[PDB]
Amino acid sequence: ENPLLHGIPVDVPHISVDEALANFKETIELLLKLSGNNTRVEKKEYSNFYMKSKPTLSSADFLKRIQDKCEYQPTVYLVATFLIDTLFLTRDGNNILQLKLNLQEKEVHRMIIAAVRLSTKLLEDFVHSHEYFSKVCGISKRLLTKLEVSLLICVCNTKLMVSNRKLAASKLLLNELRSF
Amino acid sequence: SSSSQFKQLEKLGNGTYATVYKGLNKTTGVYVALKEVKLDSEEGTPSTAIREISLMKELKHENIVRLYDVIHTENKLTLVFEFMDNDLKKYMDSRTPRGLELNLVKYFQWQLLQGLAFCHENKILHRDLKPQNLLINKRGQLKLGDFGLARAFGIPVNTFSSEVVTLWYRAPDVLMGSRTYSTSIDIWSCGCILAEMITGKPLFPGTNDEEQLKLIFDIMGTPNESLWPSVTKLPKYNPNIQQRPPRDLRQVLQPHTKEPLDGNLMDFLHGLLQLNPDMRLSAKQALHHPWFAEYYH
Numbered sequence: 001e002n003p004l005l006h007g008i009p010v011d012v013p014h015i016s017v018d019e020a021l022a023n024f025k026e027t028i029e030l031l032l033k034l035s036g037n038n039t040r041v042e043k044k045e046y047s048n049f050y051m052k053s054k055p056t057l058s059s060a061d062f063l064k065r066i067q068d069k070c071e072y073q074p075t076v077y078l079v080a081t082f083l084i085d086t087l088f089l090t091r092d093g094n095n096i097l098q099l100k101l102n103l104q105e106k107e108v109h110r111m112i113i114a115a116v117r118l119s120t121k122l123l124e125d126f127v128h129s130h131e132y133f134s135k136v137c138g139i140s141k142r143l144l145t146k147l148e149v150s151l152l153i154c155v156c157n158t159k160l161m162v163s164n165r166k167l168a169a170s171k172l173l174l175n176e177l178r179s180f
Numbered sequence: 181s182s183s184s185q186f187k188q189l190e191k192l193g194n195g196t197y198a199t200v201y202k203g204l205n206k207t208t209g210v211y212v213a214l215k216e217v218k219l220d221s222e223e224g225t226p227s228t229a230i231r232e233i234s235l236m237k238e239l240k241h242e243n244i245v246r247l248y249d250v251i252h253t254e255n256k257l258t259l260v261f262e263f264m265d266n267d268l269k270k271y272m273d274s275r276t277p278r279g280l281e282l283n284l285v286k287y288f289q290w291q292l293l294q295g296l297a298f299c300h301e302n303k304i305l306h307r308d309l310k311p312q313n314l315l316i317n318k319r320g321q322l323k324l325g326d327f328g329l330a331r332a333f334g335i336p337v338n339t340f341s342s343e344v345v346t347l348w349y350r351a352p353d354v355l356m357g358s359r360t361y362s363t364s365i366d367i368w369s370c371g372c373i374l375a376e377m378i379t380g381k382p383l384f385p386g387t388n389d390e391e392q393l394k395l396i397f398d399i400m401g402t403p404n405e406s407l408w409p410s411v412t413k414l415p416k417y418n419p420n421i422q423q424r425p426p427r428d429l430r431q432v433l434q435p436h437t438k439e440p441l442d443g444n445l446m447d448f449l450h451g452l453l454q455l456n457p458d459m460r461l462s463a464k465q466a467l468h469h470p471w472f473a474e475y476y477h
């Protein structure tokens with residue numbers, strides 16, 4: 001039942017938005033760096049998060065804007081982060097993590113939005129509008145759509161059913177990436 | 181994926197967000213159900229499809245429809261499901277009669293509760309149980325489908341919607357504004373569906389929130405604070421309105437079916453349709469009601 005959960009109390013997280021926003025950003029960097037070192041439509045749908053130009057809003061500040069204009073609860077940014085986890089990570093026969101795919105900063109910016117709106121759409125019986133958010137991200141609502149389906153397509157073969165363990169694994173998988 | 185992978189066939193139905201066609205896998209020769217979701221670049225990807233997709237790679241049970249694949253073509257998302265021959269409405273319509281024999285009912289309800297018990301075991305609420313969303317096939321299997329309104333419970337969620345569950349199948353406490361329903365909501369639906377199967381007729385054919393409550397109380401009596409003290413908490417609850425005692429359920433039903441409604445059946449039905457959310461049987465304990473005795477060891 002989902003490798004990235006193999007080793008977490010099936011019981012098993014009281015975190016604040018700052019704590020939440022922290023881990024996400026964290027995981028990104030780690031993934032960006034650790035990357036260096038199963039079908040076509042999958043990769044096909046992944047070409048999207050890759051913007052050629054340089055993200056006008058610094059990655060960190062960029063999320064600051066969104067939490068302001070959207071003011072989410074910690075949950076959002078946690079789930080958001082697991083998608084990244086589940087998208088890129090997986091354990092091996094010895095419960096040792098491994099890299100599924102290579103994550104680049106050229107793809108990071110759009111991947112951020114994808115995970116968050118997608119995340120909220122998993123959580124809330126009511127989210128912001130498609131243009132309220134398409135706005136918050138300086139994104140064409142046509143791309144926004146393409147970036148929901150892109151992510152969704154890429155991770156759908158993983159267990160995305162939201163639950164406290166998956167919520168927990170966000171922060172934990174972070175630790176297991178560092179050292180000490 | 182791969183669009184060319186499936187040959188589209190006859191329309192099998194539609195709902196609010198999707199259109200379903202029979203489909204044929206060109207390779208394996210096996211038939212499927214092609215749930216097509218419109219993807220207008222202006223409105224966005226429907227939360228329903230997202231919930232449906234996530235909640236299906238994890239909810240695997242013989243009484244829950246299987247999702248096989250998810251294809252993304254031009255402005256369209258196709259969720260490929262296992263193919264079922266009917267839904268409960270059509271099936272009953274195709275017999276139009278129109279209520280079912282009591283061994284069929286017991287057998288379909290049993291399977292409803294089995295699939296349901298699994299959802300709840302996994303902290304998942306269906307929130308849209310109604311005959312159109314219960315698929316039946318030739319072997320006679322019944323499977324919950326249409327998990328678009330589904331939601332995981334136990335977790336901190338901010339936004340609210342007491343506007344879930346198609347009206348005829350929505351619980352009184354919800355109608356009155358309860359934003360803290362758990363599994364009791366699905367159970368009420370099962371109670372309605374059970375009635376409908378027995379008589380062939382919907383139990384509470386309301387045309388609006390208020391007419392729905394009126395219909396419920398006409399039969400279940402008005403809310404009785406002695407039996408449901410927390411009722412006073414609900415925003416659309418009104419104490420002043422005129423009392424109204426429950427009717428004898430066996431009597432409101434028996435007319436519409438030639439089959440004799442015994443004690444277990446009626447009891448079992450009262451357990452599902454309890455006005456007080458907390459008093460309604462759980463799926464698990466419904467499964468063990470004596471009415472299902474012949475199904476056991």
Ligand SMILES: Nc1ncnc2c1ncn2[C@@H]1O[C@H](COP(=O)(O)OP(=O)(O)OP(O)(O)=S)[C@@H](O)[C@H]1O
Nearest residue numbers: 193194195196197198200213261262264267312326
């Ligand atoms: N696997 C299947 N096999 C055969 N028929 C199906 C299948 N899935 C759906 N249908 C039919 O298509 C109809 C619509 O499918 P749903 O998945 O219920 O779409 P929906 O728009 O979410 O429905 P709602 O929300 O109840 S109005 C169903 O009521 C069934 O009659």
Ligand SMILES: [Mg+2]
Nearest residue numbers: 195312313326
């Ligand atoms: Mg339907």
